[PDB]
Amino acid sequence: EEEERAFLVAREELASALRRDSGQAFSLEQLRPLLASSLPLAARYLQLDAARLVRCNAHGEPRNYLNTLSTALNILEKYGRNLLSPQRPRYWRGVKFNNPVFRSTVDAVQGGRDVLRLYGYTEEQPDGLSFPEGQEEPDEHQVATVTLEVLLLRTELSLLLQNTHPRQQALEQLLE
Amino acid sequence: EERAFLVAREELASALRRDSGQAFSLEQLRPLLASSLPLAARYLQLDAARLVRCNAHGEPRNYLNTLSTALNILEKYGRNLLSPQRPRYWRGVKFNNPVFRSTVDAVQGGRDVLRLYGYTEEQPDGLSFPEGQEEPDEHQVATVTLEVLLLRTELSLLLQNTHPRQQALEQLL
Amino acid sequence: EERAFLVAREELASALRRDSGQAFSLEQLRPLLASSLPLAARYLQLDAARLVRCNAHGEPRNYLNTLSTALNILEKYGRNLLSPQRPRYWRGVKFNNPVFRSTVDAVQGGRDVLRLYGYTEEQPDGLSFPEGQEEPDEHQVATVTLEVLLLRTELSLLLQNTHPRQQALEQLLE
Numbered sequence: 001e002e003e004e005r006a007f008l009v010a011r012e013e014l015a016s017a018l019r020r021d022s023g024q025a026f027s028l029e030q031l032r033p034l035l036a037s038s039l040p041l042a043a044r045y046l047q048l049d050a051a052r053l054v055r056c057n058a059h060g061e062p063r064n065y066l067n068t069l070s071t072a073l074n075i076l077e078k079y080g081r082n083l084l085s086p087q088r089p090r091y092w093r094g095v096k097f098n099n100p101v102f103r104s105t106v107d108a109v110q111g112g113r114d115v116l117r118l119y120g121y122t123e124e125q126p127d128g129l130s131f132p133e134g135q136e137e138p139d140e141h142q143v144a145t146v147t148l149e150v151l152l153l154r155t156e157l158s159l160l161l162q163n164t165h166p167r168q169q170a171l172e173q174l175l176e
Numbered sequence: 177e178e179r180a181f182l183v184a185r186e187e188l189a190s191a192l193r194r195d196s197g198q199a200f201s202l203e204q205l206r207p208l209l210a211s212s213l214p215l216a217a218r219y220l221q222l223d224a225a226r227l228v229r230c231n232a233h234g235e236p237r238n239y240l241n242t243l244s245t246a247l248n249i250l251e252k253y254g255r256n257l258l259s260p261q262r263p264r265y266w267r268g269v270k271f272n273n274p275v276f277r278s279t280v281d282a283v284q285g286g287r288d289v290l291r292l293y294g295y296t297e298e299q300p301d302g303l304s305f306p307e308g309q310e311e312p313d314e315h316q317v318a319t320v321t322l323e324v325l326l327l328r329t330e331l332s333l334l335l336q337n338t339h340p341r342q343q344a345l346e347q348l349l
Numbered sequence: 350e351e352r353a354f355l356v357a358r359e360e361l362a363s364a365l366r367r368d369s370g371q372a373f374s375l376e377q378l379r380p381l382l383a384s385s386l387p388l389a390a391r392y393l394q395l396d397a398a399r400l401v402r403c404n405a406h407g408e409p410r411n412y413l414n415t416l417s418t419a420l421n422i423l424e425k426y427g428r429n430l431l432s433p434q435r436p437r438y439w440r441g442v443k444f445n446n447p448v449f450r451s452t453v454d455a456v457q458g459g460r461d462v463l464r465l466y467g468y469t470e471e472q473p474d475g476l477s478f479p480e481g482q483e484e485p486d487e488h489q490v491a492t493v494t495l496e497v498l499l500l501r502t503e504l505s506l507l508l509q510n511t512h513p514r515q516q517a518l519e520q521l522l523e
């Protein structure tokens with residue numbers, strides 16, 4: 001009740017801060033209503049399939065695949081931040097799979113391509129994904145909400161790698 | 177070798193349409209098992225790469241058996257759609273089924289295999305065919321059924337240590 | 350035959366107490382396999398009738414595999430509870446563990462086996478030990494682990510058609 005109410009408030013608040021300033025940095029205190037929340041994962045991540053991304057990429061030592069997942073999420077977070085900035089990139093409506101950074105980070109994670117579809121890159125192409133022909137501008141509320149969930153999962157994976165997660169003992173039971 | 181593999185694909189797929197309850201031997205699947213082609217060339221509809229990657233948790237003797245059991249149930253669903261007397265409830269699959277929730281729904285991506293059969297419409301209690309579709313896609317159902325049968329056979333051969341490429345497959349886990 | 354069954358029962362239950370990783374052979378469990386004693390006397394803690402009856406749905410080649418794999422993971426939980434180098438989080442089990450959903454939670458009554466191990470208190474996301482309890486009942490854990498080991502072996506031998514009472518047990522699944 002009281003904890004579930006502060007979660008939806010912080011989610012809508014931080015999503016607008018990304019729309020107001022796409023380059024805004026968030027501290028661990030600003031995201032604490034979303035990290036320390038004892039809400040189930042289905043209620044915490046409404047768009048980003050956090051359960052899938054963790055399940056399909058938990059291979060090897062946790063010191064490595066949590067690091068590989070966090071790096072791919074940092075790249076995916078930059079894609080959503082670029083869409084929300086007033087000075088959008090010249091090729092904002094098209095991501096190519098053969099990018100050297102993309103192939104070494106996002107394409108190295110099972111399900112990283114599907115995260116781009118959440119931003120709006122829904123049209124499949126033999127070299128990448130693209131925004132649909134006709135969509136003049138991206139849905140800011142959709143991009144900001146997905147960017148916040150991507151940034152939140154990256155923060156959650158980062159907190160686990162430093163043994164500083166609020167539910168560190170609980171999350172480690174799902175990997176051992 | 178890509179031509180010989182594609183010829184045996186249409187051969188077994190046409191055999192499933194002829195008799196949906198026809199049992200295949202290891203020799204009949206030999207041109208598909210012993211093969212040097214990549215996985216993307218051997219599995220066109222079934223995403224065998226993610227089906228193993230998203231479910232290779234724990235001991236291999238455990239999750240390979242769970243994967244093959246779920247594929248055995250998914251194979252029966254495709255064979256039922258190719259039967260001359262289809263089940264009376266072939267148009268939909270319920271998530272709350274005791275057999276379904278214990279085998280297919282226990283595997284990440286098992287519902288995606290049902291979508292390949294034709295169960296594309298999502299409902300709160302399961303998946304169903306589009307209401308405007310009279311009959312299932314026999315060519316598509318037979319193709320997915322054969323690939324599901326092949327993946328389950330490959331997982332089974334790994335557990336018996338009789339896979340033709342057993343050594344190479346074990347290094348991928 | 351009841352005294353002979355209990356004689357080898359504590360012999361295997363004590364072997365798991367000293368060495369939890371010590372694997373048992375078929376000849377070691379055969380005295381407990383070919384016994385014509387009723388199931389009520391062979392399983393005192395594990396509800397073997399519940400696990401088989403409530404999950405014998407579909408083809409026997411399918412649910413016997415699902416039952417065997419779930420018990421193999423349940424046997425790993427009991428063995429780790431008796432290990433001298435216990436895991437750091439032996440006091441709790443999460444339902445959303447990717448191995449748990451595909452094996453134990455896929456079987457009707459699998460969570461009750463964890464309660465026999467000691468995981469009696471329930472959380473919205475799993476089961477855990479009571480806060481007052483600091484060490485598990487090594488006698489009860491080894492007793493349940495042995496019976497879980499017993500049921501897994503019985504289901505595995507039936508799938509291989511090498512069970513000592515194969516024809517008798519097959520008549521209970523028609």
Ligand SMILES: CN[C@H]1CC[C@@H](c2ccc(Cl)c(Cl)c2)c2ccccc21
Binds near residue numbers: 041042050153160174
């Ligand atoms: C169904 N989702 C599961 C698996 C993901 C798993 C999870 C979620 C986030 C992270 Cl960062 C990790 Cl390591 C693991 C989890 C956590 C709490 C409740 C449920 C779940």
Ligand SMILES: CN[C@H]1CC[C@@H](c2ccc(Cl)c(Cl)c2)c2ccccc21
Binds near residue numbers: 349
């Ligand atoms: C990209 N696909 C990979 C992973 C699956 C992996 C594979 C395929 C079938 C099985 Cl039964 C297993 Cl255990 C593992 C494989 C095999 C041959 C060529 C490629 C691949």
Ligand SMILES: CN[C@H]1CC[C@@H](c2ccc(Cl)c(Cl)c2)c2ccccc21
Binds near residue numbers: 387388504507521522
């Ligand atoms: C009513 N008691 C039943 C339980 C299940 C049944 C049983 C027990 C173990 C297994 Cl492996 C199977 Cl297939 C079936 C049985 C067997 C012998 C004596 C009694 C019983």
